């Protein structure tokens, strides 16, 4: 009749195999230091 819209170990494994700030600082640092 009607529709409503309302609001661990895997984590450590992806870090080992490769933070949002880390990947944004590396991008920022690369283009400047050289």
């Amino acid at each position: 009749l009607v529709t409503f819209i309302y609001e661990g170990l895997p984590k450590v494994e992806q870090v080992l195999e490769v933070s949002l700030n880390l990947e944004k600082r590396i991008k920022g640092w690369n283009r400047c230091i050289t």
Binding site: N21, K24, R25, G28, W29, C32, I33
Partner: peptide, 21 residues
């Protein structure tokens, strides 16, 4: 965190003894 500003990052590395002149 090391600041995104390159010269602030250089100063941080000098203070954290990562790299110096």
């Amino acid at each position: 965190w090391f600041p995104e500003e390159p010269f602030e990052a250089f100063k941080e590395m000098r203070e954290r003894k990562v790299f110096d002149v």
